[model samples]
Target: LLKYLPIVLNPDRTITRPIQIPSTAASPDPTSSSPVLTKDLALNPLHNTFVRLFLPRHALYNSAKLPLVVYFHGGGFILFSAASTIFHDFCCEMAVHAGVVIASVDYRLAPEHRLPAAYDDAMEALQWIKDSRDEWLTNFADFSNCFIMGESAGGNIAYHAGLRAAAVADELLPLKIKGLVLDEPGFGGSKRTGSELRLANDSRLPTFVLDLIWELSLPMGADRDHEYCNPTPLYSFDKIRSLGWRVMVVGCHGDPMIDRQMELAERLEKKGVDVVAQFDVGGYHAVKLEDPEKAKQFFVILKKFVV
Candidate 1:
């Protein structure tokens, strides 16, 4: 998501990028006042994208390690990238607000790479983070305690990424990934609950937009039940739960995607997993716009959970 471009919305809505502090100012070196985007280049031979690290004013201690939160940005996996203005602002603000290092990921987008591409990139980034922990800790990036979070499309990435991380912890990338936060995760299969049917025609995210997103995200000629779309049950919910990761889910009432988010949380809780959730009835699908106060409250949960 290179600085927001004009976005065409459905029916007759449109949006231009917000005028927030530029990414440079948000993540600059305080000593030299120079903008240095700290990053970890991909070690895997397959992927080319790098992961950028942003540290808050609290900063990391040379003598002691700090906690971390790795974030993914949302745009239905096709339209947005990690460096987008909105998520860039969110990442910088979140780092400052939560007093933790935040690694904003630049995963592969769709129509070109499609479903598993984003998942693969995310898994690679996590692996990179885990492998680079000692070196990063020497330079002020901690990997001992960490959490993964995202909104909308990014939230979907967080969920599946958590599963992937849990599944392969002992094999490759191993770390204490404490909690998972999914803000309005964009995942829905063939099943349509009451909320999906009732709000399927939502003005903010109408059926057409849903169809367009699916068309762009799925491999050519793949159905909704394709492995990418339904990353649960098949992945072994029991197996994911057995990892004992605390999960926090938040969603918007007006969002057509709410039902699935709620459903996922419910299913996870039923498996004896510790879960907390809050739904905003009047809120839209957007994370920042859902509720400023609620967002702040969740940040509190995030800070505590990461510690």
Candidate 2:
């Protein structure tokens, strides 16, 4: 494939090089100093996906149940892992800052696993959390005050998964979804929009590369406008208003998808849906992952939403 189409097969262009940062193996060991404790669990033995759980160190002995946050990481649905060092450290900081229990999902990736595979894994992980079979969740987390959050492609997952939760709310009555946070969601369209053209070369994700990502990540026959990728159809005014969960949509001014994200907030608000829009002016897509100050700011925004 590389011989004929270099853009699609080359891992470098796709940023698919697997980066594994040990759970506790760095100079300043990101997880070492935190008052947070971490562990991993496989939702299903046959599935490659698993979840990493983070808790305040005192959770084991504490009587107060902390709010639960289920998180998904972003890689255009093709790269990164909850167990990756970057995500691990980020979640550790998030768990401490937000004062909540965090479950970062390690969903299967694409160009290998495909669309609903990741989506299914995410919902399955949520199901596991709802089942409350794990002592960590049963003893330390408050399911009634739970939140779903993600960045970039993970943000897309959070939206779809939240919808699924709403669809089956009757079954998950005791496990209420209090809110949703979508930070720099990677929404797409079949036709190029103004932001895509203006910020083509500026974003960490270039305009030209988005199509390739959609190709590699979405199901075999899916396109940029598919419900999973575009998400415009999923946000009908009445549909969103009925979800009954507060939503926080975060986007960077410099990101190409910022326009679409803003549109989402606007439409939802017009329909009387509770929505909050947070933007980092002059910021790039996924800036928190690269800039420490931005990372802190990201958590602050998240803390405000989740807490």
Candidate 3:
């Protein structure tokens, strides 16, 4: 029998996948292209979860506070961290370009922790910010202008976390979520989507890898179509109408999941949600990170969406 690739699986059923292409552990430094002030906070002690906060250097000079962007990094629910060099650098760039303060969440990953665990951590982090008396937030960040953003799986977390926040509006009153920036959001269902079929073999987001991610990250008995992954049936566009926030979805034409991404944007518009759709014809999944031109384009839209 042919031996399977290590990232694919192992007999003991443990997931030992490496971080995706262009992985790193280095934190932001002065020599970096987008240097910024950075700090780390331990949000939950027992769970060993934390967040990496990024602030633009000019924050102290600005008379007005910047928007608070609570960000989630993508890793298919199994890899990457807020401090991962790639994500850390990306957030640094975003904070500078968008003129916003960023709180990059370092939630627990799956196979060991699983579905709602990541979501729980995200919600907890948001609540911490809501009640925070931290100087960074109180002085430089604006709660009323807050937004949630994430890439791929992180995008999924942004949606669910925002949904949860909306549900508890009473407790979180005055701490509003203004919008959602979902860049190449991770979304799927049981039925094979047209894009999924056509680009099933695409190297960047192969169907088999997506299937395995669901297997490892979902609740033990749940499948891909579960509300966490599918979510369409649980809350119709109308049901989420009161979210009272605009949504900007960024998709790349070369990405395998572009169809579903656009489908989500269309459905949201049809249901009366303020929606902005962005499409890049020649980029791949999460290509903005590596492509300066695309990254600049995305930052422009993000600034417009949040500011």
Candidate 4:
């Protein structure tokens, strides 16, 4: 508790935390040194948003194209980046195991940029993929089979951005958003769920800490029940189903958000949306970031979906 504690939220809404995660630069050419080769590109120069791309070494010369996955990292919508060591390694592993090209987005964080900002940037990442004729994408990315994935809060962004993408899906030529991979989505409500009560004092992320992040991330005046926070009541995902997109919701029973995640997946199933739910047991939120073994297990599950 001591190590993760003591982050102070200031009057200006900025937080001063204890430790900082390290960032990694994209690997250089020659491509043989690493299993995955990575490069960075600007998505929205005006806003200083960019994407770090990962390509499996096999993609270098192979004739077969792989799925293009636009991914977003989670820091409760406040902390990490595409270049962060944890996320960088995660994407690298994903590119290898899933044999997919990954566009890891670096979007603006919250308390500075609120709702709709991250959502807009995420969608534009897809649009950039569609509009730009980058060498890697043009050569080896199978745009027809594409996915938007996110970890934790990034999952919330994917869902919001996905809805917009589904609406204008046809207009965005060449890129088809086939599905979503929400890894432990950051979702909450005005009323608590069973797990919230069960794990209210869970050290991983106490209720107040989780709510405080939502406090900073959501629209300033909005409560937990805002449409952005709780999408359970939103009717009609007909647009998503009509587009024939599948959804994969991943979580673990030990996570506080497990109940909501399970409910979301169950509701999507009832809505007749094609859903693939992965609920593991006895794991905390975002355990993959902390455990390499857990990450490998994740890649295997993702491989089954992508392949």
Candidate 5:
């Protein structure tokens, strides 16, 4: 086995119990009194679900409207949270570097909730974001200049929400969504791609990772090929052809989902949709967000793309 790859692993980190960000205190931002991430906008009377906002520092925001990017954190649909260091770091960088407002969702995990619950929560949050900016996220916060972005499983959420925004038109969604950016999303392909077979035993993320993700996102007897796991056709190029939204996809050569990413890009291009594709050589699954420097560059490109 090739054990010489320089991929860094935080062996100390392990998925433990479900961590909840008590619908109140968000990951603190000590640099400014204007808390970047405001926790729990409304009571969400029914589900106790609330939206979190991550806005840039005062220096980044002037009077003009800035593009807003709603982000979904990747955790195999089960593990991570909006407050996790990895997610916090990435969203913070996006807010500053992109000089745009970024909001991350604290969607409920599966097994306890199941597939569409997280998606439903995100869409509801989207509805809230479009309606009013709110003091927590800020009122009149430029919903017109909004774009959707997500990573891994969040990618799935972004795709579903983005499609909904397009399908229903601006009349349904409060603001007009401009574009979508997905990072190595697991859209469930027609067949396993070449990279999937090659990296079946990948060091950072093995094939077993999908099994874990499935267990987390679905109920005990659910099939992996269901609409959620395998969402390619629903969001394939054809489905979104008339949406006219810009799509930016980023993937790594070493990752198992590269082929599907490429396919999605090509499909979009053929559909005459504006597309931007970025790739990394010999990069692992989540390197861009995990590495501060790379994460900065990622946001830099995103900033340029959005604003």
Candidate 6:
């Protein structure tokens, strides 16, 4: 129902004019300049979602397995894929910069299968990773130092999934979750924030676009104040603090979601959870994905954050 985006939400919930960003095939070639190699696998055929695995070239020929980052791509929860060229290239960039294995997750889109559907696919991806027979994970991933990370809408997924995973962390022996990285994450509430009012016309992601995405992604008949949209009533922060998983939030003033990101860190800190929030003086939403220089800076913060 928006005029700016290349997407159109149809009356039947199916979208139109989805400009396809072609996905790339995995390459483990001997002479590619890219430091990382990638492969895509069906994480779950039932939900029709996939996970792409990325390993730095050094990882394959080295002895010590690297830390793992289970990453969720952000497209307002209605766009992009783990294998899309943009995300795949970014994941490769991340593997080298963060010095870790990347599990770029793809999830089912919303409006047709909304809210819990995406969350369900996320947890299932974790289970699939836990039980994977893939050599990349078995041979090159350090299972004990795992982190769940996401951008924009994926940030919400990571947050929700992290809470669930932590509740049963001990049960997932051999596989462990160390923390969360919500990079310029997007979350909403019925209550208004000054940031939203100021960024009402943000060219990258305006207020109208934000409202529409939530409408399409949330449960049918749900308001922006629903548990899926807002985190005020999330899984108890005291319980999260008890797990001792460190959380790092990255944000910039130029983004509309700046207040939400800052507030998330604030709430976590008040609950006694270890949290570090890095706020850049300036930058638009998802600037790291578009600018190599910014992405390098992000890598540094991520490197220091994920133990």
Candidate 1 lDDT for residue 286: 84
Model 2 ranges with Cα > 4 A deviation: 1-33, 58-61, 233-240
If scored against the real structure, what TM-score would every candidate get? 0.82, 0.88, 0.91, 0.95, 0.83, 0.95
- Residue 43 displacement (Å), model 2: 0.9
Model 5 bad stretches (over 4 Å): 1-39, 42-45, 59-61, 136-140, 189-191, 233-241
Which ranges of candidate 1 are over 4 A from the true structure? Answer: 1-27, 32-47, 60-64, 133-139, 231-235, 289-294
Q: Pick the winner on lDDT between candidates 1 and 6.
A: 6
Q: With candidate 6 superimposed using the best TM-score fit, by how many Å does residue 207's alpha carbon deviate from the native?
A: 1.4
Q: Cα miss at 1, model 6 (Å)?
A: 7.0
lDDT of 1 by residue, 189-238 (tens): 76666877888777666666776677678888887777667554434566
In candidate 4, what residue range of length 10 has the lowest lDDT sum? 1-10
| Winner on lDDT (3 vs 6) | 6
RMSD of each: 5.0, 4.1, 3.0, 1.6, 5.5, 1.6
**Residue-by-residue lDDT tens digits, candidate 5, 1-307:** 1142212223452234533422234643545464354454552557656556776665344566567788888877765677676777677677767777777877877556778887887788787776674753454257777788899889888877777667666564557678899888876543567887888888866766666667557656667667777654344454456666789999889888787778777777877778899988888888887677878778778878886
Give lDDT tens digits, candidate 6, residues 1-307: 4455668777786777567667888887748776788888887787788888999987767799999999999888888888878788888888988899999889988776789888888898898888887998999999999999998888999998888888778877688888898888879988778889989998867887899889889987899988888886445676678877899989899998888889889989888899988998888988888899999888888888865
Write out the backbone clash pairs for model 2: none
lDDT, candidate 4, at 1? 30
Question: Model 4: clashing residue pairs?
Answer: none
lDDT of each: 0.69, 0.78, 0.82, 0.87, 0.70, 0.85
lDDT of 3 by residue, 1-307 (tens): 0121236466887766653544344344544544588888889988789888898877766678899999999988888889887888889889989899999999998888998899999999988988988887888898888898999999999988877876775687456788888889998887888888888887667887778778888999788878888856436444357767888899877787788788878878888988988877877888987888888888888888887
Q: State the weakest 10-residue window (summed lDDT) of model 1.
A: 1-10
Q: Please rank every candidate by lDDT, starting with the best.
A: 4, 6, 3, 2, 5, 1
Poorest lDDT segment (10 consecutive residues) of candidate 2: 21-30
Comparing 5 and 6 on lDDT, the stronger one: 6
State, as a TM-score between 0 and 1, how close model 2 is to the true structure. Answer: 0.88
